Enzyme design. Structure first.
Site: not given
Ligand SMILES: Nc1ncnc2c1ncn2[C@@H]1O[C@H](COP(=O)(O)OP(=O)(O)OP(=O)(O)O)[C@@H](O)[C@H]1O
Lengths: 61, 104, 131, 141, 116, 56, 73
Positions: D2-4
Site C-alpha cells: 500500500s502506497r500510504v
C-alpha cells in the site's frame, strides 16, 4: 520425631481441608457462573427473535 | 578382524569412505587402517567448520593430546589384566560412537 | 569436604560437581572414596555410583567404565551414566522383567555375553526404585 | 503493498502493526523451514511457531466484521506472545472467546481505544490482565 | 492460457523448489554444526581415554594374559560393517559407501572368510 | 518397654498414615477441583447449544 | 483510516479514507467477500458505502443486497 511428626502432619491436614473449603468456595463461584451466563442465555431466545423483529419491521415497511 | 567402513570427514565437496580395523584394537591403542595410512592413537582429528574467503568448508584440527604418563604413585585397585579387559570395551564404544558421529 | 568429580561418557559429561563421598562399584570392590584420597585407578563396572552430598544421598547408576580416581581431581571414564532421578521406577522394573526375557534366549557362548549385559542393565535399573 | 503505509492507521495500529508486519515478514521468509524445523535453535523455533499461529490469527470467518478496538487486541495477542502456549488450532477459538470476554467485561478498553485512539500503558495493562484471566479460564476450558 | 499458464506453473514450482532446497541447505548446515558440537563435547572423554590407555600400557609393557579383544592370531571370519546415513537424496553418499562395501566383500570372498 | 518402643514406631507410622490420607484426599479433591466447574459450566453450555438450536 | 473489519487488510496494509486500494485476485477468491466485509463493518462509522456492481449476475446482486439487509447495513 517430635519436630517432623507435627511439621508434616498437621499443616498437611490444614492445607488439605482448606483445599476442600476453597473448592467449596470456587464451586460457589461456579454456582454464580451459572448466573454468569444463564439469565442472559434464557433471554437469548427473545434476543435473537426481537433483534430481528426490527428487520421484520423493515420487511413490514 | 572386525574392520569397519566409516566415512571420515575430509572435505565438504566429497568425503571418501575409509576402512579401519576396529576390534583387535592393537593394544598400544593405535587404531590402524587398511595398511598404508594407519593411525597412531592420541593423534586425533577434530574437524572444524570455518568459512574460507566466502563459502562454507571444513578444516581439520590434527590436535595431539599431551599425556601425563603416570600419577606419582598410581595404585591399582584391580589387577593389571582386569583393568584392561574393562577399559578396552570402553574405548571400543568411544570409537564406535565416533565412527557414527563423523559418518553422520 | 569434597573432590573434583568428572564422570564422563562418549557424547556427554554427566555430572561434574563436588561431593563428599564416592562409592563407585568395581568388580573386585565397592571402593568408598572421599577427600584427599591417594591416587587409585579402578576398573569401575556395572553398579550404582552412590554418592553422599550433604543435601541427600543421590544415587547414579553407571553401565561401566574406568576411574583414574586421584587427589581430589578424579575422572570416572564411565561408559553410560544416568544421573540422579532421571531414571524412572515402573519402567525400570518392567525393563528388569524384559531383561529376564532377554536372559533366557539361546546360543552357547556367542549371545550369553549380551545376556550378561542385559542382566547387568537390570542391575543398573534397580537403582531407580532404590532412588 | 500500500502506497500510504503507516500514515493512515491510528496510533494503536501504528504501534502494534509494526511488530505484526515484521513478524509476518520473518515468518514468510522462514516459511520453507517450517516443514523441516527439526530441533533448530530457540529463536528460529519460537519465531516460526508464532508465525504459524499468526497466520491463524489472520484467517477470520465469513462476513465477520472486526471493529478497530477488537482487532487491535487481537493483533497484540498474536504478536507479543500471549497465545504461544496454545497449539495452532485453538488460536481461533481462544481469540474469539477472548474478544467476547474482553469487549463484554472490560468496557474501559473500549473507552480508551475508541476515545484516546492510542495504545497507552493503562490500556496495555488492562489488556494484559484480561488476556491473562482469559487464558486461565481457557485452561479451565 | 494453457501455454503461458504452464510456464507460470513451472516458474512458481521452480521458485518454490529453490526456496525448499535453500531451507534444506541451511538445515543440513545447522545439523552438521550440531554434530560437530557433539564431537567437541565428546572429545574430553576420548582425550583422557587415549591418555589413560597409554598410561596402562606404560605400566605394563603389554605383558598380559587376558583381553579377548586382542585375539589377533588369524584372519578367519572378518565382520565388515558399514555406518550409513538415513536420509533421502543423500548427495552421492550411499552409492559410494556400499560401493566400497561391495569391493571389500569381494576382496574378502577372495580369501574365503564368510564375511558377516 | 517393648510396648513403648513399638508405640514409637507406630506413632511414626500413624503420622505417615495421616500424611498418606492427606496425599490421597488431595488427589481426590484436586480431581474434583476443575471437574466441578467443568460439570456445571459444560452442562449449562451444551444444553444451551441444544436449546438454542431448537429455538432457531 | 477506514477499518475493513479484517486483521489482514487493516494491520499489514491499511486503507485510509481517500486512498483507493485495489482488490485484485483470481476468480472466486473473496474479492466480493472482502468488499462485503468492508461495507458490513462500516456500520458504526458514518460512511455512505456505494456498492456498484458491473456485469455480476442479477441473482448474486440479490444475494448481496439481502446479505446487506440481514446485517442491517
Ligand atoms: N472468510 C470466509 N469464510 C468462508 N468463506 C469465504 C470467506 N471469504 C470468502 N469466502 C468464499 O468466497 C466466495 C465468494 O467470494 P467472491 O464472491 O469474491 O468470489 P468471486 O467469484 O471472485 O466474486 P465475483 O463473482 O464477484 O467475481 C463464497 O463462496 C465464500 O464461500
Amino acid at each position: 520425631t517430635i519436630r517432623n511428626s507435627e511439621e508434616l502432619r498437621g499443616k498437611a491436614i490444614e492445607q488439605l481441608e482448606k483445599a476442600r473449603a476453597r473448592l467449596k468456595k470456587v464451586e460457589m463461584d461456579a454456582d454464580q457462573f451459572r448466573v454468569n451466563g444463564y439469565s442472559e442465555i434464557e433471554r437469548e431466545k427473545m434476543n435473537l427473535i426481537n433483534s430481528t423483529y426490527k428487520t421484520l419491521e423493515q420487511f413490514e415497511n | 578382524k572386525v574392520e569397519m567402513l566409516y566415512t571420515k570427514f575430509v572435505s565438504l565437496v566429497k568425503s571418501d569412505p575409509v576402512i579401519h580395523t576396529l576390534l583387535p584394537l592393537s593394544p598400544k591403542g593405535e587404531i590402524c587402517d587398511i595398511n598404508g595410512k594407519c593411525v597412531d592413537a592420541a593423534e586425533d582429528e577434530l574437524f572444524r567448520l570455518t568459512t574460507k574467503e566466502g563459502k562454507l568448508t571444513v578444516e581439520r584440527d590434527m590436535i595431539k593430546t599431551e599425556t601425563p604418563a603416570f600419577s606419582p604413585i598410581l595404585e591399582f585397585e584391580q589387577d593389571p589384566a582386569q583393568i584392561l579387559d574393562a577399559l578396552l570395551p570402553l574405548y571400543l564404544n568411544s570409537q564406535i560412537l565416533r565412527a557414527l558421529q563423523e559418518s553422520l | 569436604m569434597t573432590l573434583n568429580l568428572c564422570v564422563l561418557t562418549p557424547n556427554r559429561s554427566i555430572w561434574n560437581s563436588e561431593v563428599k563421598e564416592i562409592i563407585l562399584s568395581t568388580n573386585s570392590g565397592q571402593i568408598g572414596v572421599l577427600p584427599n584420597h591417594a591416587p587409585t585407578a579402578t576398573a569401575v563396572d556395572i553398579g550404582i555410583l552412590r554418592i553422599r552430598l550433604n543435601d541427600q544421598w543421590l544415587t547414579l547408576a553407571l553401565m561401566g567404565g574406568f576411574a583414574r580416581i586421584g587427589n581430589n581431581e578424579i575422572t570416572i571414564l564411565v561408559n553410560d551414566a544416568e544421573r540422579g532421578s532421571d531414571i524412572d521406577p515402573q519402567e525400570a522394573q518392567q525393563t528388569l522383567e524384559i531383561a529376564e526375557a532377554n536372559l533366557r534366549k539361546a546360543e552357547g557362548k556367542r549371545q550369553k555375553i549380551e545376556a550378561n549385559l542385559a542382566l547387568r542393565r537390570a542391575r543398573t535399573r534397580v537403582e531407580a526404585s532404590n532412588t | 503493498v500500500s502506497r500510504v503505509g503507516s500514515a493512515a492507521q491510528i496510533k494503536a495500529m501504528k504501534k502494534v502493526a509494526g511488530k505484526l508486519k515484521l513478524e509476518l515478514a520473518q515468518f514468510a521468509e522462514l516459511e520453507a523451514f517450517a516443514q523441516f524445523a527439526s530441533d533448530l535453535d530457540k529463536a528460529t523455533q519460537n519465531q516460526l511457531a508464532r508465525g504459524q499461529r499468526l497466520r491463524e490469527l489472520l484467517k477470520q470467518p465469513q462476513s465477520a466484521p472486526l471493529t478497530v478496538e477488537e482487532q487491535v487486541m487481537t493483533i497484540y495477542t498474536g504478536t507479543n506472545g500471549y497465545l504461544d502456549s496454545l497449539e495452532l488450532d485453538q488460536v481461533r477459538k481462544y481469540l474469539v472467546e477472548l474478544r467476547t470476554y474482553v469487549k463484554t467485561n472490560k468496557p474501559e478498553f473500549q473507552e480508551i481505544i475508541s476515545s484516546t485512539k492510542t495504545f497507552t500503558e493503562e490500556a496495555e495493562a488492562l489488556l494484559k490482565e484480561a488476556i491473562q484471566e482469559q487464558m486461565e479460564r481457557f485452561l479451565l476450558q | 492460457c494453457a501455454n503461458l499458464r504452464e510456464l507460470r506453473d513451472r516458474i512458481g514450482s521452480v521458485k518454490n523448489t529453490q526456496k525448499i532446497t535453500e531451507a534444506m541447505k541451511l538445515v543440513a548446515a545447522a545439523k552438521v554444526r550440531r554434530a560437530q558440537e557433539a564431537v567437541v563435547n565428546g572429545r574430553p572423554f576420548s582425550e583422557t581415554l587415549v591418555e589413560v590407555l597409554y598410561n596402562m600400557n606404560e605400566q605394563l609393557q603389554t605383558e598380559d594374559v587376558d583381553v579377548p579383544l586382542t585375539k589377533i592370531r588369524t584372519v578367519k571370519k572378518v565382520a565388515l560393517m558399514v555406518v550409513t546415513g538415513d536420509r533421502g537424496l543423500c548427495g552421492g553418499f550411499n552409492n559410494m559407501l556400499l560401493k566400497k562395501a561391495e569391493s571389500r566383500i569381494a576382496e574378502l570372498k577372495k580369501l574365503g572368510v564368510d564375511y558377516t | 518397654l517393648g510396648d513403648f518402643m513399638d508405640k514409637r514406631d507406630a506413632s511414626i507410622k500413624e503420622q505417615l498414615s495421616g500424611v498418606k490420607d492427606t496425599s490421597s484426599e488431595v488427589k481426590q479433591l484436586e480431581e474434583q477441583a476443575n471437574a466441578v466447574m467443568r460439570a456445571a459450566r459444560a452442562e449449562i453450555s451444551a444444553a444451551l447449544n441444544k436449546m438454542k438450536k431448537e429455538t432457531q | 483510516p477506514l477499518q475493513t473489519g479484517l486483521i489482514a487488510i487493516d494491520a499489514m496494509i491499511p486503507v485510509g479514507r481517500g486512498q483507493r486500494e485495489l482488490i485484485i485476485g483470481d476468480r472466486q477468491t473473496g474479492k466480493t467477500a472482502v468488499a462485503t466485509d468492508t461495507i458490513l463493518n462500516q456500520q458504526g462509522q458514518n460512511v455512505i458505502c456505494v456498492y456498484v456492481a458491473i456485469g455480476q449476475k442479477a441473482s448474486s446482486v440479490a444475494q448481496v443486497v439481502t446479505n446487506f439487509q440481514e446485517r442491517g447495513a
